[PDB]
Amino acid sequence: VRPVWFPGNPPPAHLDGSLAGDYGFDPLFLGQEPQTLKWYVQAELVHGRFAMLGAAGIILTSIGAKVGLGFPEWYDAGKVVVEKNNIDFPTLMVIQFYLMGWAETKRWYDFKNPGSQADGSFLGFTEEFKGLENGYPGGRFFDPMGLSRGDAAKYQEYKQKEVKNGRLAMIACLGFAAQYAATGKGPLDNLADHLADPNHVNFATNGVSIPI
Amino acid sequence: RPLWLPGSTPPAHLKGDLPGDFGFDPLGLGANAESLKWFKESELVHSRWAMAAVAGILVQEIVRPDVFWYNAGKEVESPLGPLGLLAVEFFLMHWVEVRRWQDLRKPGSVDQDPIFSQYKLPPHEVGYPGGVFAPFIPGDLAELKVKEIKNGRLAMLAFVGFVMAAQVTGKGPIAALQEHLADPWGTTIFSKAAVVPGQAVAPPCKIPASVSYKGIEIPTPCFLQGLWP
């Protein structure tokens, strides 16, 4: 009864509806086993969140670029700023890897042992380093605004909208990637051009998308 | 009961016990209780802040014009050292704020003058010290809290309006209002800028750039000048 991505075909076995965005879409049966399925759930969540980040950053920098504010284009900002300031590739990379490794291995051993992270083995902390769901570590910090502890219906709706916008952001970031690698240009600029003439400023005329 | 939207229905946790409430939480933020207390407290703090600031800016521009309120920071001169002013400010205000915070975390725990044991504030709720703080009350606390929150939210609006109007005109709000009266049609952001698929226009910022105090040379960027129209 749930809207099935392929209207007319029934969902497979493991795809049920308990999770957010269960449009019955796993035509490759990649989620029969519940271990692997919870696993790919956490994977999809983190990826959607990263994509939401990336889209926001790219679009804001691109606006700042079109407007006369000197902001570079995203695929160059890195080199341009690292050469601007007195930064070292090695030191930046190593500090980044340090901190990310710490936080991420903590999340990992939490997924392994679902409770052993708020065990006070930290500084003194507990009731915050303890998970709430598989990939939903809302405590006093990861949900400091405290919506997870109120109006479970509204909370479910928020999980739904979160995963929806996450999938959209993933698709849009890949959009950006192709836009740039094809038009050798700025994304917002390609946008303005297709605005100028949708009939002719489009992939049908980009002469690469359609290789004819 | 009044509602911000007449004809609608309030949310669940929003009941009507808190002064000046109108069932306005279309995002149900007031779900959890401790969060709710924190947010009411912070609202009161901000309201009183904005009230003080807007009254001050108004009377200041009135009495000592030609000194840009937005620019009193640089334009101020004092025989006392700026380091001294910032130090005394930081210290004493750190004290008052940490005392209020100790109160909030442990209610009614510090209501004695720790030197003048004779002097002692009576118990009370949060965000409502009273006692010596309230030595003169014409009327009723019920209506008074309402007027307080009303004027506080309004003052927040007024302050942010001053900020944007100064970023777009660089004028004292009084003179800007004189201008708006002088021209009913042109003194509008609609008359000032717009956006259409054809092109986008945004009025130029009025605060120039980084301003140089005694060597510091403060960098002063506009508030998100990029998306102003």
Place this chain on the structure above:
Amino acid sequence: LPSWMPGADLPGYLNGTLPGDFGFDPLYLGQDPVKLKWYAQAELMNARFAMLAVAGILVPELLSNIGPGAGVAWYDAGKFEYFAPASSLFGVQMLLFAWVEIRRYQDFVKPGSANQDPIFTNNKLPDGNEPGYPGGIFDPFGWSKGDIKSLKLKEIKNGRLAMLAFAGFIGQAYTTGTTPLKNLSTHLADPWSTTVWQNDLAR
């Protein structure tokens, strides 16, 4: 119970048994009672020491400011003859330190076990030993009347105070390259410009 933090949660083991407990230990460094006794002892020691030290560093310079055998700066130690080299002085020093120090330790370890002059067997310190408070002939002026509370209290308080003042002395000396009294006079001349921040920024 005067707390170092009005309205805070004092850990249990701190109980005001010793002079001047405010429940101040955000690190729980005395939960083990043997450590606790050791630390109260060493605290009283270092405290009284810093007291005598600040006293006799302040007094000499302050009297040198006016009307005499010397007026040298406090940390300028090695510069005098004193009719003998510092070698033999520090020698005899440490020998005598050893004797009465090994007996201070005896008093602490085995209480009531060192009260009488082994030579002057008649001469004998009283029996209310209280390791860390010999009194008796150490109280040769009728004191210990006010019960003990304010005495021990002001003692440990001024001791911690003098510890802090000594540290500040080291700080001004090392940084300014000057003498604490002169640093004082300067800040007196102008507080609004004699600030650590002024000095570090100029540095």
Place this chain on the structure above:
Amino acid sequence: RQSWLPGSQIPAHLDTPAAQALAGNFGFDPLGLGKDPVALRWYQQAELIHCRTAMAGVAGILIPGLLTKAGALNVPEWYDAGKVAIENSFAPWGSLLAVQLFLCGFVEAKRWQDIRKPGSQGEPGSFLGFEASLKGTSELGYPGGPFDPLGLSKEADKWADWKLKEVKNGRLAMLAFLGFVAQKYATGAGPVDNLAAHLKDPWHVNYATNGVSLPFL
């Protein structure tokens, strides 16, 4: 308990009365080298000796090395003091090493016969007065009498703490020594000098910028 890795499981062997009662235990043997108890005890002894010797060596390096920066105690670098002292010497290094080898082998033989059989060296008459205090202190690796001369063991409430701080400082000493040799290979200068360099600039004085530790960059 305190585990080097929260969330992780404790090694099968590492959770036993002896192990939890040994010292400094945090369930750390992902190679399970202690799945055998005799080997485990042997390795505890090895680690003890290593902690002690490494603490001694790192002190002997840092202290004169630090005070050579001070005016007095001007001393050459540690990796050259060998040459320096053998120049200022009086005996051929061959004979020196030989005699010190003998005198170390004797004491090692004593320690080893003990670790073979604990009550080995209390054999009456085997010496003239040794066997009196030449007997273990019930804990293999803590000889008594002259060893522990200041009676620090007659106070058990400090016993655990002594053991723990010993093992901690020993492990730290081993680590510091490895850092020493690694940086003497990479940079080649005084350890205090590498210290002062990274302090004068952290963000660029580091293996990340040595061009050697990470050669591919």
